[PDB]
Write a protein that binds this ligand. Structure first.
Ligand code: ZNG
Length: 359
């Protein structure tokens, strides 16, 4: 069971909107996590007796930048960890976490970036979701924009979240238009676009790299939630998603026995497999997280309470809930992060505080 072993507060006193453990940290090295809030990203190291050691920050040159998301990857040639951050300026920054130098940046989105995700099998493929209603897929090895997921049949309002499935064959995205949309990236067109992005070297050719314009999702529903959908994650072939209605819904496209890879774009049905209710989390912009193995699910609420669900059960509706409270933790928990082994759970808050829970 989890016990709160420590807490701290960042000096900017602004909300912390993101937190991620580095699940690519090397064997024998202490566990490391990043936080994003105000116009900065900060790294910490977890030590014994609940110690959280402060390392170093990246502070944006723009005092008006607001980072909203961060994601870890590694350099595909050296294995060294890399950290990607983005927010209100709509600029993706690739940071060397050792020195906190910005090694490169990507511009493209017409507005703020709400979430970054790396492909589960390819460390170079980065997905960004934006307030400009689109998703973008980048190849950070050749610095190319592989594809833009948008158009009339794409999202009709700001995109808040997206997630890759287990093999990175498809993406589920969600946002302010109340919809959840599926985008297959294992199509002949998308597998070819990814192969071409790797073959692109602007020093060895005259052509610009041509980005795919994907204007039609492979599935779409507005039947799960009745407000902004601000967080989505795959749970095998099933989906976990939430709005600001005090619930995480577990669902799938089509009928109960329909295989996800047989689903057609015209599919009009969904199946609800369960719903995890909770309290006082009815404000926009609150994220839930799962651990590496997807044995657990965590979400914080707007008054500092943590909910943890044990997903190691036969069916999703049988998940077992644990609640974690501390008399000094009373600010909204925007995001949580589990260490790769789930031995540590970190919660980050609206008052710039960080809470460490050890198993
Ligand atoms: O218009 C905004 N303004 C900054 C802001 C301000 C507050 C306030 F309460 F502090 F005022 C709360 C949330 C946000 C915020 C927080 N987070 C995002 N995007 C990232 C995000 C999502 F896109 C979806 C769920 C999330 O859970 C926590 C962060 C998060 N925002 C995008 N635009 C805004 C946000």
């Amino acid at each position: 069971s989890f016990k709160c072993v420590n807490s701290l507060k960042e000096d900017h006193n602004q909300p912390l909107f993101g937190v991620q453990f580095n699940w690519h940290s090397k064997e024998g090295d202490p566990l490391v996590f990043a936080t994003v809030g105000s116009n900065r990203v900060t790294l910490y190291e977890c030590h014994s007796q609940g110690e959280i050691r402060l390392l170093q920050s990246y502070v944006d040159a723009d005092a008006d930048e607001n980072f909203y998301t961060c994601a870890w990857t590694y350099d595909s040639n050296t294995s060294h960890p890399l950290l990607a951050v983005a927010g209100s300026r709509g600029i993706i920054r690739i940071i060397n976490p050792i020195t906190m130098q910005c090694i490169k940046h990507y511009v493209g989105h017409g507005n703020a970036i709400n979430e970054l995700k790396f492909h589960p099998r390819d460390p170079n493929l980065l997905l960004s979701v934006s307030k400009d209603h689109a998703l973008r897929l980048w190849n950070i090895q050749t610095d190319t924009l592989v594809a833009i997921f948008g158009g009339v049949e794409g999202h009709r309002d700001e995109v808040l979240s997206a997630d890759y499935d287990l093999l990175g064959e498809k993406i589920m995205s969600c946002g302010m238009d109340h919809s959840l949309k599926l985008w297959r990236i294992n199509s002949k067109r998308m597998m070819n676009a990814i192969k071409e992005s790797y073959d692109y070297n602007p020093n060895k050719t005259n052509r610009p790299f041509i980005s795919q314009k994907i204007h039609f999702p492979d599935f779409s529903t507005r039947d799960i939630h009745r407000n902004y959908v601000d967080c989505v994650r795959w749970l095998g072939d099933l989906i976990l998603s939430k709005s600001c209605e005090n619930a995480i819904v577990c669902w799938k496209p089509g009928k109960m026995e329909d295989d996800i890879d047989k689903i057609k774009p015209s599919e009009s049905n969904v199946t609800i497999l369960g719903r995890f209710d909770y309290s006082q989390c009815d404000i926009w912009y609150m994220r839930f997280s799962t651990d590496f193995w997807q044995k657990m699910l965590a979400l914080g609420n707007q008054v500092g309470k943590l909910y943890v669900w044990d997903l190691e059960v036969e069916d999703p509706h049988k998940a077992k809930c644990t609640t974690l409270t501390h008399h000094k933790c009373g600010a909204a928990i925007r995001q949580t992060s589990f260490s790769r082994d789930s031995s540590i759970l970190i919660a980050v808050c609206d008052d710039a505080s960080i809470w460490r829970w050890d198993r």
